[PDB]
Amino acid sequence: EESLNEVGYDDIGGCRKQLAQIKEMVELPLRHPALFKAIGVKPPRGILLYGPPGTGKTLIARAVANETGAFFFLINGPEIMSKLAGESESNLRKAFEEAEKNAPAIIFIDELDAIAPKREKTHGEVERRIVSQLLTLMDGLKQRAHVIVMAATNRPNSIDPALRRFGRFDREVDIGIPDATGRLEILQIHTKNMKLADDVDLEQVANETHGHVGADLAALCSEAALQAIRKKMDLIDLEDETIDAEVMNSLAVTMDDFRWALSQSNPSAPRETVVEVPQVTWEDIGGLEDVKRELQELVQYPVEHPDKFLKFGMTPSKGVLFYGPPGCGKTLLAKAIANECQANFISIKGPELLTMWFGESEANVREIFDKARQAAPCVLFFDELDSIDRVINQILTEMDGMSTKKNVFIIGATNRPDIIDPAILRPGRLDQLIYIPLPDEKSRVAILKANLRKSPVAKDVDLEFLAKMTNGFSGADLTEICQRACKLAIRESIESEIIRRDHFEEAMRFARRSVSDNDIRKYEMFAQTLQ
Template sequence: MEKGKEWILKVEEAKSRDVGRGIARIDPDVAREMKLTPGDVVLIEGKKKTACIYWPGYAEDIGREIIRIDGVTRKNAGVGIDDKVKVRKAVAKTAEKVTLTPTEEIRITGIEEYLTSVLEGRVVTKGDRITINIMGRQIDLMVTGISPPSDAVIIGLTTKISLSGKVAKEELRIPRVTYEDIGGLDEAIKQIREMVELPLKHPELFEKLGIEAPKGILLYGPPGTGKTLLAKAVANETNANFYSLSGPEIMSKYYGESEENLRRIFKEAIENAPSIIFIDEIDSIAPKREEVTGEVERRVVAQLLALMDGLEERGKVVVIGATNRVNAIDPALRRPGRFDREIEIGIPDKKGRKEILEIHTRGMPLAKDVDLERWAELTHGFSGADLSALCKEAAMRALRRILPEIDLDAEEIPAEVMEKLEVTDKDFYDAFKSMTPSALREVVIESPNVRWDDIGGLEEVKQSLR
């Protein structure tokens, strides 16, 4: 939709390969009307303003009037998925100087020159957050100054990058995980968005219908499949405060303290709504009451039931529980009005494994011989956590190769040593040999010690089998 020289477009999530590159893919029909060519700068305005480099949209997006931007860009524009943004073509000059403030301390010699080479071609506006990957470590940088002052500037090889000595503060209660950081769970994301995002962003829809918004969601599946990650992504995408708790944090040896811990977290979440309360391993704090002998567990289950029934703030506080033993949970918690929806999070298939590998190698300097398609095929039975561990172990093996060149007593690592880091196919193979997929860990195959002579009769059958 055109508005003067602005177009109003709907925001969609970026594809995994586009994350962290500072690009926007726009519906090809709209891009044609805007007279955009690849490499042009577009200004994106939501609650805040940011800028991106335009890249051609996908064939599947033709006629949909959408713009695909990653989670960091959505934060910079102050919007979420399905929100509308104003988009217009802009002209950006190469910056003379850009001042960046890290959210944590960086200790690398020649970091300014390294950042110039990494960020070359990126378009930035003052107030933007940029995420870069250094040796497998994700670092956030805030753009705190640009010269000459402008709506947007491009970082070129002549741009002087200045790193501020201060460390920028982050919003600790809101996780940084986005939907693009989750692979192989498209159906689960769709369900959880419908159950959580809609009530948190538009509670008036439920008021109009005269129904209560969902209060709870139960995620169940094997360990390491992305249940916690999914809950964090929802909290981030909805700008909700995130409260994570597990059994040991709640349980106490003192009478009444376990229930008090639960009440305190729920009270804090309600006061700071919109909020998401995530209860990991919920079966450990809310087991079936008829199967437990301890009085504490029964009181905690009763308190949790009472708290979930008392969530009167319509849609502003959502409880997400996670477990790998769904049938061990007290049945009273699983009725509608408490945990309204149960979503299974399973072991990823080949397509999901490839997505997860692409996510975990996104900022990794991969050698040309690494074929992620092949590794997705070889890693049958691997969970998301297993694949993450595989990528980390492969990176560690690459790091061990250049360790002799690193002076461990030096405060900072030279940038030229960083440039030599490269993860090869052999690193992945060596890491793969040392791993057992968690989904198959409990399956033990034992070769029986039985010989043909131990079987009496059945000569014809034995002959056929031979």
């Protein structure tokens, strides 16, 4: 059989739901090669794995080929771009002929932007003789012995749009940035020949690596292995001997080796939108039980009974507006909305779409909307709605899709009642708003319990006895209160010559009181305009 060093299904732990989607796409054509000759159903030829580079997209194709048992030729895009004019088309044709020779098989096109850009972009004519004959060999769809052309690209709007037409590249699956649990899985994978000691736990290590692709996670565990082996075998002065197995197994990576490898800069994945299914429940956001009661009607009630809600002749609401004071848990309530729906989270920000405004990147607005269309089920939180009217126009003209079966919930948060234009206020598009108020006693106490449970908590406080003077201290304001209280705890605790109730109670008798008291009536006139 094949060697175990080849990649298997177990070796990938980035996005296993997308792995299941790829298996659901291509497993039946590949494991069952004759069934499509009997049925009159076209198999999906040409799925397209789009995502950031280094997400392991070659390993997906190699793993599904090696588990399935299909032959795996690889057309690297930069490999056939450097052959001379006419030789590159000839090599592409021989690659597809070799694919059709030992079929069933799968052939990969890594870095299709090197073959096909979105614009023509290249005023020489040998590029169009390369994307042409690739469009022709996309029409290997004769319901043959099955070949599936998996492809890779940096962005799905970076390829030529003639590829996205039907019959050429039909399915378009996002491999996606891995989540924190996927980071735990991939660090658990990347230890089998590294042979860590028991001190390294990798949980907080994976949690500290948010915003990075699987490639530089493999590079950071490799770098930690380099730091662990760099303390020895030259200091031991035994390079002259053979490479000793008991020395390597006696060596182990250490916790501060991982801290060292993380400490050097690894921004191989530039910062982008996030894909995550949160575990943050209703209770972790403080109070808001009437807001819970409305939002259960808004998202939990349609997904508990989609058949009964659709049977009553009305679609579910497209999304709620969060309207009220800024930073009062309204930003983190979308975690509970996604969690109790068991849906994914997208948290694209206001200044991000402002950068799309200033760079005229409304194509990126369309791309993140279609990204939300791809994620299923998911929620589309977006704060700072009053910051933008090109982006308001683009949001309104792209929200017209009616993917209520996708259960996308278009939730937006802003503080300005009517400075934001009433083009959103038209009924049927996005109008079932709610007034999120200032955090009250239960809200402040429960958000203090949640944000103080995650810290070392020597409380010794009745939280009503602490938060009674908070007339309108917001959740952002009270987490800043906890921030400066724990900073004074740092101030009195780290001073030494070489407990925490004191800092809560000096925050209780503190002289810094800053509450936006005048804005509750500013919300209340428009709330009474609702009446």
